[PDB]
Design a protein around this ligand. Structure first.
Ligand SMILES: O=[N+]([O-])c1ccc(O)cc1F
Ligand SMILES: O=[N+]([O-])c1ccc(O)cc1F
Lengths: 127, 127
């Protein structure tokens, strides 16, 4: 891939959510640039690089069942960026919660995620 | 208002949509900082300041039948930012159409919008 087109961004971002839903940590990490950053939630310091990003996804998706689904269409740009709304369902203390999130991503000139920013706060959690 | 809290961001960003929906250009412009920027769509160069911003809203809201509604919750941060998904219904050449958008906003230390970025492309328009 080169810089993804708007259409390619929609496909990549939807792919990403599919990978989160099934919980394929290694497949998620490979979507990222080797030196990518993740800010989760937006407002917290970034994490840097695939090792730290893999640890992030392992922490969240490693154990119990997690589901994730788009809750509206991906909004893509013509500069390799996009934003998408989704919901993550998880068990927290035997307690089924849901978290509503919007991710903003920028992709590099190879089609990998260079930056991810996850907008949400505790008000977006529901038990 | 100081830097808005996550709850305050949710209220402001929801109010913004209510004002787009009712078509109140002056009330929208008043929500922006005097030297704010708007990037619409994200990927295009920013416009700057209340005069340019007012001209943007007036193009669309002055006389057109326009409705706008959140299509999911506002995702707020603890650093005065947020992101929200919504749909704008408008009329184009006598055709009803809908545009799916995500706005990302950063508010200043006075509770006014410092930056707005509207993610969407042609793939988000339905005629
Ligand atoms: O559950 N999260 O905090 C979460 C945040 C952003 C993501 O892109 C995926 C996720 F699972
Ligand atoms: O129709 N738009 O392009 C549009 C974009 C962003 C907005 O905050 C409002 C709008 F009506």
């Amino acid at each position: 891939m080169n810089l993804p087109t708007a259409q390619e961004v929609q496909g990549l971002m939807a792919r990403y959510i599919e990978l989160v839903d099934v919980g394929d940590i290694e497949a998620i990490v490979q979507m990222y640039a080797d030196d990518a950053t993740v800010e989760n939630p937006f407002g917290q310091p970034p994490i840097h690089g695939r090792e730290q990003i893999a640890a992030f996804y392992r922490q969240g998706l490693g154990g119990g069942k997690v589901r994730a689904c788009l809750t509206g269409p991906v909004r893509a740009s013509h500069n390799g960026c996009g934003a998408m709304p989704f919901r993550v369902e998880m068990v927290w203390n035997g307690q089924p919660c849901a978290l509503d999130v919007i991710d903003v991503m920028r992709f590099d000139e190879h089609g990998r995620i260079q930056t991810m920013q996850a907008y949400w706060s505790e008000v977006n959690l529901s038990v």
